[PDB]
Amino acid sequence: LLGWGLKQAEEANKTPDKPDKVWRIQAGKGFNEFPNKEYDLYKSLLSSKIDGGWDWGNAATHYWIKGGQWNKLEVDMKDAVGTYKLSGLRNFTGGDLDVNMQKATLRLGQFNGNSFTSYKDSADRTTRVDFNAKNILIDNFLEINNRVGSGAGRKASSTVLTLQASEGITSSKNAEISLYDGATLNLASNSVKLNGNVWMGRLQYVGAYLAPSYSTINTSKVTGEVNFNHLTVGDHNAAQAGIIASNKTHIGTLDLWQSAGLNIIAPPEGGYKQKTEVQPTQVIDGPFAGGKDTVVNIDRINTKADGTIKVGGFKASLTTNAAHLNIGKGGVNLSNQASGRTLLVENLTGNITVDGPLRVNNQVGGYALAGSSANFEFKAGVDTKNGTATFNNDISLGRFVNLKVDAHTANFKGIDTGNGGFNTLDFSGVTNKVNINKLITASTNVAVKNFNINELIVKTNGVSVGEYTHFSEDIGSQSRINTVRLETGTRSIFSGGVKFKSGEKLVIDEFYYSPWNYFDARNIKNVEITRKFASSTPENPWGTSKLMFNNLTLGQNAVMDYSQFSNLTIQGDFINNQGTINYLVRGGKVATLNVGNAAAMMFNNDIDSATGFYKPLIKINSAQDLIKNTEHVLLKAKIIGYGNVSTGTNGISNVNLEEQFKERLALYNNNNRMDTCVVRNTDDIKACGMAIGNQSMVNNPDNYKYLIGKAWKNIGISKTANGSKISVYYLGNSTPTENGGNTTNLPTNT
């Protein structure tokens, strides 16, 4: 219950023991003259002063030094050249070896493995088993702080297996290092490469499913390339292991447990370093920061999960205070029981760069049932708060799997939660930005504080209503979505959709309407549009699209596609700058737009060189089947406060502001404006006669000469531009007079 961070910090600073009987063996002559002999080293040197034994209680073998475990020995060779194997030291209790083998390749295995234990007597002693070989080459298994047999006999105290070779501590494929409840081990060569099963923490007893079972592989000063291959933390317990590495830790396969921990800790920046009785200064550190080039390339994470079912998750962790955390191509795996299993990928003072696909139960989407809500979790740069969680790979969520990220600027590339839905896609700790490139949501709990998701997919969820893409926090100032895409949803019901809950503005540039998916736009007061605000099916709109607003603004040139079949309902101040909203008829009817409070619109010299006159400010297309002799309400207007940069209209004048709103608009048909036919040359006379339906402009271009750099308004078409109504009075596509009236000049701003 203490935690590993206390335990290793208080066990790395002790006195070894009080050994009486310091046996001092020394290899003499004969050993130091055969470079290739392959000595044994237990029987050929050691076994005089290491005795076997039988314990009354769970014995097979029993080794100590001499007459009780409270005795040291040493072996001072320093010249004995050869290659020395151990081969079969099982249940070694012993104490305080240091097989000081200079210029000697080691081996710890042939036909049998090894063990290094102590006993939990009244002294609670360590073992402090050192070696000082040249290579090591473990090459079979090893059971540091194991059990004697099963249960009987005695209990086991702690141990240390220091291993301080000088060429590189490799290993074998079949060499299962199994360090248990108390065992640590230092290493101090260069370029360890443990190519076998590293098994930190195990059931030391068969029934003890509730042991803390700490460990440590303090590869402290390994000056080369640390390299694991197969790390398997935990077995049926909360094994809180730890590693204090040396700022480059490639590992391979990680196989955690449900509730076992891991503390991969980088170095500091500068690198490491009666009577009253006074204990020595038990120095203890707190959670500190890595150095700069502290690399942890855990390139595959797995997580087995089997056993009983608890009320919640278990949340295996790996606190990793290096200044990086790269996770490669195997990415993140998980396995899920009936309760939602949980992975805690922390980083105190670094970054995270996961370039691998998230899986759960080993598939890319990863569906899960409603009770098994699998919980992925990332904490990038916690105690510096400028830490990024870059996921440079396309992630994918199935159903009932949960992401949360607490970073500074959690960049992304691709998010797939709309395939399954029911995915808590949390972002609750994001400091500023979440720069997602592609988003897929169906029934999702997205909550981002500030972002720019430059592409959006709005999916439905079949027939379930009330479950949708529910933004549940502040969207805020610098937010942006460069493309919204509502896919054409289900039949006759708004099952999926999007609503907001907070924020002040959202610069959306592109939109798509859709049957039976709703773009609810709650609580955001400056919904700005800058380019094409379109529909997914302009050739055939149908269904409904609840665009239940509260306020918006349209900037420049942003066209809109409002049908009768996508009920855009504004409950606020539609403020329209120089943008050309287009209509479609769907049966000769003008789709009126219901401005809730005030369609306050201000413009400027919004002129195009297509006519020489101004841009068609509100465009009425496809109105050739428009019903003649009928007032067509264009949009419901409540207050139209027009303005330009001056009082002067149609260029510069003293003319009032509202009259040219009859002029700049367009009933855009026959590839021309049926409102006015602004003519600057002789060739457009044919298209003008096609617009008005008169042979006076078809067969004769020189018929009318009032139109060289001029214009004329079509009589028989009137509009309202007061402060209370915008309408269209289409009663005639009439023939104009030549030099009598309804003719204007050019504004001359092109």
Side-chain angles (χ1 to χ4, degrees):
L1 59 92
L2 298 176
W4 181 76
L6 300 179
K7 184 70 174 177
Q8 186 268 325
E10 68 93 16
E11 287 291 326
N13 46 5
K14 288 182 70 172
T15 60
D17 271 331
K18 182 70 174 178
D20 48 353
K21 296 183 181 295
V22 183
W23 304 100
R24 291 188 291 115
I25 306 170
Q26 173 179 357
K29 73 185 76 174
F31 284 113
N32 50 5
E33 59 192 2
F34 299 107
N36 299 114
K37 193 176 180 296
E38 183 59 29
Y39 299 94
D40 191 355
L41 200 273
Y42 177 71
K43 188 176 262 77
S44 74
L45 186 65
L46 287 170
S47 181
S48 177
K49 297 299 179 70
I50 296 169
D51 52 354
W54 182 265
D55 187 78
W56 295 102
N58 68 2
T61 58
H62 189 193
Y63 296 101
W64 59 92
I65 302 305
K66 183 63 70 177
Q69 291 83 16
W70 54 88
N71 296 318
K72 200 183 180 182
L73 69 92
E74 77 178 3
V75 172
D76 182 77
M77 301 180 190
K78 285 187 175 71
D79 53 359
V81 184
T83 162
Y84 297 88
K85 68 181 179 66
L86 261 286
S87 177
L89 184 62
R90 297 181 62 86
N91 285 320
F92 178 73
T93 57
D96 295 328
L97 313 178
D98 42 349
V99 188
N100 187 0
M101 297 179 288
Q102 269 57 235
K103 57 188 72 65
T105 300
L106 181 54
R107 176 176 298 162
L108 268 84
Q110 180 62 43
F111 184 74
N112 192 358
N114 291 314
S115 295
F116 299 101
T117 319
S118 64
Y119 278 158
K120 188 178 292 295
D121 295 334
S122 67
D124 290 328
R125 64 186 68 251
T126 57
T127 66
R128 305 299 183 95
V129 179
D130 305 341
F131 295 94
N132 198 357
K134 178 251 292 180
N135 291 107
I136 282 170
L137 271 291
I138 290 287
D139 293 332
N140 202 357
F141 66 97
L142 188 147
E143 296 180 356
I144 310 171
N145 196 2
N146 59 355
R147 189 178 59 239
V148 178
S150 296
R154 282 180 289 272
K155 301 293 187 291
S157 66
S158 71
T159 172
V160 168
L161 191 76
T162 310
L163 286 168
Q164 298 189 4
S166 68
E167 297 296 327
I169 307 165
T170 74
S171 176
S172 175
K173 187 63 65 67
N174 52 2
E176 182 176 3
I177 300 168
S178 69
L179 69 159
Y180 293 4
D181 180 79
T184 78
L185 70 93
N186 187 352
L187 300 172
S189 76
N190 51 356
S191 70
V192 184
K193 41 190 66 59
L194 293 174
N195 305 327
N197 189 2
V198 178
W199 189 275
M200 291 193 285
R202 195 178 180 93
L203 298 169
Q204 187 183 5
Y205 290 93
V206 66
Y209 290 165
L210 298 175
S213 69
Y214 303 103
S215 69
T216 301
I217 305 172
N218 186 359
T219 69
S220 180
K221 265 68 184 299
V222 183
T223 61
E225 188 268 330
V226 186
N227 192 356
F228 289 162
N229 192 31
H230 178 81
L231 177 59
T232 313
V233 176
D235 188 77
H236 295 284
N237 50 6
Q240 295 177 357
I243 290 170
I244 300 173
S246 70
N247 74 23
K248 194 268 176 186
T249 312
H250 181 280
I251 78 164
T253 299
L254 175 60
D255 294 337
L256 294 179
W257 189 251
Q258 295 177 355
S259 62
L262 190 70
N263 299 112
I264 294 173
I265 298 170
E269 175 65 35
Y272 290 96
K273 178 174 68 67
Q274 294 179 357
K275 185 67 174 66
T276 69
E277 59 190 4
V278 175
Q279 310 292 319
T281 306
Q282 182 176 353
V283 179
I284 168 169
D285 288 330
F288 65 98
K292 296 297 185 290
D293 49 355
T294 55
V295 183
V296 179
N297 298 327
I298 298 170
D299 295 337
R300 178 59 183 261
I301 300 169
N302 300 323
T303 302
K304 295 184 289 184
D306 50 353
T308 63
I309 299 166
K310 198 180 72 178
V311 299
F314 288 94
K315 193 181 287 288
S317 71
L318 56 100
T319 298
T320 311
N321 55 5
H324 302 281
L325 182 65
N326 301 113
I327 290 175
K329 279 79 180 174
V332 175
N333 196 356
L334 190 146
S335 295
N336 196 357
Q337 200 185 2
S339 295
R341 302 281 76 78
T342 302
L343 193 66
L344 177 55
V345 182
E346 206 272 333
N347 184 345
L348 288 170
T349 65
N351 311 326
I352 294 174
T353 305
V354 175
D355 301 340
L358 278 75
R359 295 178 181 87
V360 43
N361 300 108
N362 199 358
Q363 73 270 19
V364 180
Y367 297 99
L369 59 93
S372 71
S373 66
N375 297 316
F376 293 97
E377 187 169 1
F378 297 92
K379 304 283 185 66
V382 171
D383 293 333
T384 57
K385 291 180 286 294
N386 54 6
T388 72
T390 303
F391 294 6
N392 209 164
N393 194 0
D394 179 74
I395 75 167
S396 295
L397 276 77
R399 191 178 176 178
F400 290 106
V401 289
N402 301 321
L403 174 59
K404 68 177 297 300
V405 178
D406 299 332
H408 185 76
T409 306
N411 299 329
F412 282 94
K413 296 296 177 185
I415 283 91
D416 302 332
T417 63
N419 196 2
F422 297 93
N423 306 122
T424 303
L425 193 65
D426 194 1
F427 293 92
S428 65
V430 173
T431 299
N432 53 9
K433 302 302 287 292
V434 179
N435 303 330
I436 292 172
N437 202 3
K438 186 176 187 294
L439 181 59
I440 297 172
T441 56
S443 68
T444 316
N445 196 359
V446 180
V448 187
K449 287 179 174 63
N450 186 3
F451 56 91
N452 46 1
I453 304 164
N454 56 2
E455 200 279 332
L456 175 58
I457 299 298
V458 178
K459 286 179 68 67
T460 188
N461 50 0
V463 296
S464 67
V465 296
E467 292 170 348
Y468 60 96
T469 305
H470 193 194
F471 290 0
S472 65
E473 66 176 0
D474 176 72
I475 301 300
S477 68
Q478 296 301 112
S479 181
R480 176 173 172 176
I481 296 172
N482 284 111
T483 297
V484 179
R485 183 170 295 113
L486 276 72
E487 59 90 21
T488 63
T490 181
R491 175 74 271 175
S492 70
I493 191 164
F494 287 99
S495 299
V498 165
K499 74 174 65 176
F500 300 156
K501 281 179 68 176
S502 176
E504 65 176 1
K505 62 179 288 184
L506 179 58
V507 183
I508 297 171
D509 290 337
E510 205 278 337
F511 185 78
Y512 293 111
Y513 295 97
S514 69
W516 300 101
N517 287 324
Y518 63 97
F519 183 72
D520 191 1
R522 296 290 87 195
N523 300 319
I524 289 178
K525 300 281 102 176
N526 297 114
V527 180
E528 199 276 334
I529 308 298
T530 314
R531 64 178 181 87
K532 184 177 183 182
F533 190 86
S535 65
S536 63
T537 59
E539 70 274 12
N540 48 5
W542 58 273
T544 50
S545 302
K546 293 190 289 184
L547 275 77
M548 185 179 175
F549 289 157
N550 292 119
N551 193 358
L552 80 98
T553 303
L554 193 144
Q556 295 85 17
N557 302 113
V559 302
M560 291 178 69
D561 296 331
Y562 178 69
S563 178
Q564 295 85 10
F565 291 155
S566 67
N567 46 2
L568 181 141
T569 307
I570 298 171
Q571 284 83 14
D573 292 329
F574 177 76
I575 296 170
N576 195 1
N577 208 3
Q578 297 91 18
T580 70
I581 300 169
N582 196 1
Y583 288 101
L584 70 156
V585 288
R586 298 293 91 193
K589 189 261 183 182
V590 173
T592 182
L593 193 145
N594 304 114
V595 176
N597 195 2
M601 294 181 285
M602 185 177 176
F603 286 89
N604 210 169
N605 49 4
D606 49 355
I607 194 163
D608 53 355
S609 179
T611 61
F613 187 71
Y614 292 105
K615 294 192 289 183
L617 189 146
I618 294 170
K619 293 182 68 65
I620 305 164
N621 199 359
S622 70
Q624 280 291 322
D625 55 356
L626 189 65
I627 300 169
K628 192 176 287 294
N629 295 317
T630 300
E631 174 178 1
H632 295 286
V633 288
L634 194 63
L635 61 93
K636 294 297 291 182
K638 269 72 180 172
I639 292 94
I640 306 301
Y642 187 82
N644 288 322
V645 298
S646 65
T647 305
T649 65
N650 290 316
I652 184 65
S653 66
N654 53 3
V655 184
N656 54 1
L657 277 302
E658 70 273 16
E659 56 90 20
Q660 74 273 13
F661 191 82
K662 272 79 66 178
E663 297 175 355
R664 294 195 181 104
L665 268 63
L667 199 148
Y668 184 76
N669 282 110
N670 301 117
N671 296 319
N672 194 359
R673 296 171 62 184
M674 284 174 63
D675 194 2
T676 182
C677 183
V678 182
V679 176
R680 293 179 291 174
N681 55 3
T682 61
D683 188 75
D684 55 352
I685 301 300
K686 278 80 177 176
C688 196
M690 291 297 172
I692 67 172
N694 290 318
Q695 295 300 109
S696 67
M697 287 77 164
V698 173
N699 294 319
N700 43 4
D702 54 354
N703 193 4
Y704 294 96
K705 299 297 289 183
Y706 67 96
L707 41 81
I708 298 97
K710 271 79 70 180
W712 63 269
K713 184 179 183 293
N714 194 1
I715 192 64
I717 295 169
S718 178
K719 291 184 293 300
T720 59
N722 54 2
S724 67
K725 189 65 180 68
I726 296 172
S727 177
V728 170
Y729 293 92
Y730 182 73
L731 58 93
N733 192 4
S734 298
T735 306
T737 183
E738 185 175 1
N739 290 318
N742 288 316
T743 65
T744 55
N745 294 319
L746 292 173
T748 313
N749 290 316
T750 55

